[PDB]
């Protein structure tokens, strides 16, 4: 297959401004949200129809209860960081768990925490240790590392359990995730400032979002500077991007095993 990935996030805010959940937890399969839970709904609900159509109420019912418990731990863990830091007011706590199933069949896994949107603790499944960014992170690290049972459990979840779920969800939403929608690439030429020609290579209507685009002079990579456009959602499940250079030039586009050349 192509590189697909499963990940879930947690967000905890202390003293939230009216209309902001205290806790949010959202799951993704690549760029697609699959699940959602927050402290307001108090329900784990789907964010994709292929999740709704393929997962029985039993799943949603069980995971809501787990998330209700996981919500409360998050609040406690954040109160404990704030005490350690001597912080007052509103502060954020985040978690990101997930795995990647590569094209070659190999796998990656990750488990990281943040405090105030900055790296706090990063799990290393290969050694079963937590990388701490400071002394507060270090105090937590010493406590988390004291439960060896839990570290082995997470190594198994990331390595074994996560990959199975990703493969399950990938069959559930194959018509969406494994589809290919080729880009529609154009080149536009314009004399900008007196003496400066700007060439643009604009691609759109493509899925998956991952696209490679570059400018080449005589079939050799530009010695000069290329400006890059962000891969952006068009709103219809397709993406758009661009790459540009100043002034024999050609635009190159690689997307899902097909190479395109647009000579100028």
């Amino acid at each position, epitope marked *: 297959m192509r590189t697909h990935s499963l990940r879930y996030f947690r967000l905890g805010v202390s003293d939230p401004i009216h209309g902001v959940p205290e806790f949010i937890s959202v799951g993704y399969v690549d760029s697609h949200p699959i699940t959602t839970y927050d402290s307001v709904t108090r329900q784990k609900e789907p964010r994709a129809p292929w999740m709704a159509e393929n997962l029985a109420p039993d799943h949603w019912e069980r995971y809501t209860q*787990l998330l209700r418990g996981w919500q409360q731990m998050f609040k406690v863990e954040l109160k404990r960081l704030q005490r350690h830091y001597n912080h007052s007011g509103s502060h954020t706590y985040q978690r990101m768990i997930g795995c990647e199933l590569l094209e070659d069949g190999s796998t990656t896994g990750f488990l990281q925490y943040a405090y105030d949107g900055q790296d706090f603790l990063i799990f290393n499944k290969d050694t079963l240790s937590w990388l701490a960014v400071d002394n507060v992170a270090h105090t937590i690290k010493q406590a988390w590392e004291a439960n060896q049972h839990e570290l082995l459990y997470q190594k198994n979840w990331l390595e074994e359990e996560c990959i199975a779920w990703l493969k399950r969800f990938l069959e559930y939403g194959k018509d969406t995730l494994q589809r290919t929608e080729p880009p529609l690439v154009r080149v536009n030429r314009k004399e900008t400032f007196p003496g400066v020609t700007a060439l643009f290579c604009k691609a759109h209507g493509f899925y998956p979002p991952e696209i490679y685009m570059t400018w080449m002079k005589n079939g050799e990579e530009i010695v000069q500077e290329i400006d890059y456009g962000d891969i952006l959602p068009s709103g219809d499940g397709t993406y758009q991007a661009w790459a540009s250079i100043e002034l024999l030039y050609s635009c190159h586009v690689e997307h899902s095993g097909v190479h395109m050349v647009l000579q100028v």
Partner: antibody
Amino acid sequence: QNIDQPTEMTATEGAIVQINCTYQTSGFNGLFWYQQHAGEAPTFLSYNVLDGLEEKGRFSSFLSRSKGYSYLLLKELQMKDSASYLCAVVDSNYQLIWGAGTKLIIKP
Amino acid sequence: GVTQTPKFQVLKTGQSMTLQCAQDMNHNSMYWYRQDPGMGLRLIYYSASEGTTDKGEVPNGYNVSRLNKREFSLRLESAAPSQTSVYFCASSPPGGTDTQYFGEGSRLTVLE
């Protein structure tokens, strides 16, 4: 789904006994062994989630995730080891599915 | 650890009964199981955390109350002879794979 254990086992005092446990489950998040004496509460013995054999005194518990199998091995058997041994498995929905138990009888 | 009451109870068919369970281990998740000969422990109801409960495997004939962080009581509204069993209360942190700590048990007998 299914957890399977021998109903009852009998071994002689001073010997070794292996209590086998096989599971057919939707996912795997670890396997527990608990001891339960006649008319008493179950007490935790071990937790295994990665492949291998972990020793804890005269009791050692082993796991093979590929073979979906685990064993509780009891060395230098004592009359006091006479109890029910409960096998339990955490599935993909984090539900503990408990096995019916293995009554261990110790011939002195 | 986990304190459950009563150790034994006799009930007439139709009588109401409340088993009590308390724990001072700062555990979030709490469980009510029923042990019957020939089968593994069967969950009746569980409480993932203070403020939540859900039906387990065998919830018919029972209700639960998670009164606070420490207390989780099991209610038999109209006792039936099928409810003659041994009840165990259990508690663990809310990871999902955290070790369960058990109450002493509760022999309940429902007679006509």
